[PDB]
């Protein structure tokens, strides 16, 4: 194996060991460089109940370069793109070789609850999160519903 693979296996061991609440994840049988994870919509939030499927794409540069994360499930969020791509603080400009999958997974879970307004990937979602949070929760409910797909 390469530095990358070994690290990811260690990262898996930890996640396995003591998993964060409502967060799950494991790599795919072919190439440990591709994973599938599950984030449960944090309690007491419009994303509550929904069960989200995500994929993490790693390079052989891990942990030096972070992976890219996408929502497999249908998503509606000020910081999520049309193809499910997540725009996240620690995933870009603020990444640390120290961070691990559990960490990455935990952060996305929180972003759900607290989207950062700074230049949204989905202007419509932002428009509502701001102007009308009434229909915002309305649309998310629609996604929280999709998850069970």
Curated annotation (Swiss-Prot):
Instruction: Name the keywords, alphabetized.
Output: ATP-binding, Nucleotide-binding, Transferase, Ubl conjugation pathway
Primary enzyme class? transferase
One GO CC term of this entry?
HULC complex
A Gene Ontology biological process in which this protein takes part is:
protein polyubiquitination
Residues annotated as catalytic:
87 (glycyl thioester intermediate)
Q: Which domain of life is it from?
A: Eukaryota
**Which chemical reaction does it catalyze?**
S-ubiquitinyl-[E1 ubiquitin-activating enzyme]-L-cysteine + [E2 ubiquitin-conjugating enzyme]-L-cysteine = [E1 ubiquitin-activating enzyme]-L-cysteine + S-ubiquitinyl-[E2 ubiquitin-conjugating enzyme]-L-cysteine
Q: In which pathway does it act?
A: Protein modification; protein ubiquitination
From the UniProt entry, list the residue stretches annotated as the region Disordered.
Answer: 1-27
Q: Which Gene Ontology terms cover its molecular function?
A: ATP binding; ubiquitin conjugating enzyme activity; ubiquitin protein ligase binding
| Residue ranges of every copy of the UBC core domain listed in the record | 3-149
What is the E.C. number?
2.3.2.23
Primary role: Catalyzes the covalent attachment of ubiquitin to other proteins.
Which protein family is it in? Belongs to the ubiquitin-conjugating enzyme family.
How this chain assembles, per its entry, is:
Interacts with ubr-1 and rfp-1. Interacts with ubc-13.
Q: What is this protein called?
A: Ubiquitin-conjugating enzyme E2 1
Organism (species): Caenorhabditis elegans
The root-end lineage is: Eukaryota, Metazoa, Ecdysozoa, Nematoda, Chromadorea
């Amino acid at each position: 194996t390469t530095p990358s693979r070994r690290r990811l296996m260690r990262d898996f061991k930890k996640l396995q060991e003591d998993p964060p609440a409502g967060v799950s994840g494991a790599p795919t049988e072919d190439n440990i460089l591709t994973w599938e994870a599950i984030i449960f919509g944090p309690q007491e939030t419009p994303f509550e109940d929904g069960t989200f499927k995500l994929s993490l794409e790693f390079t052989e540069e891990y942990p030096n370069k972070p992976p890219t994360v996408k929502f497999i499930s249908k998503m509606f969020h000020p910081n999520v793109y049309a193809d499910g791509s997540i725009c996240l603080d620690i995933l870009q400009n603020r990444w640390s070789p120290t961070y691990d999958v559990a960490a990455i997974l935990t952060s996305i879970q929180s972003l759900l609850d607290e989207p950062n307004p700074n230049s949204p990937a989905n202007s419509l979602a932002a428009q509502l999160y701001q102007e009308n949070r009434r229909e915002y929760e309305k649309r998310v409910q629609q996604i929280v519903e999709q998850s069970w797909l």
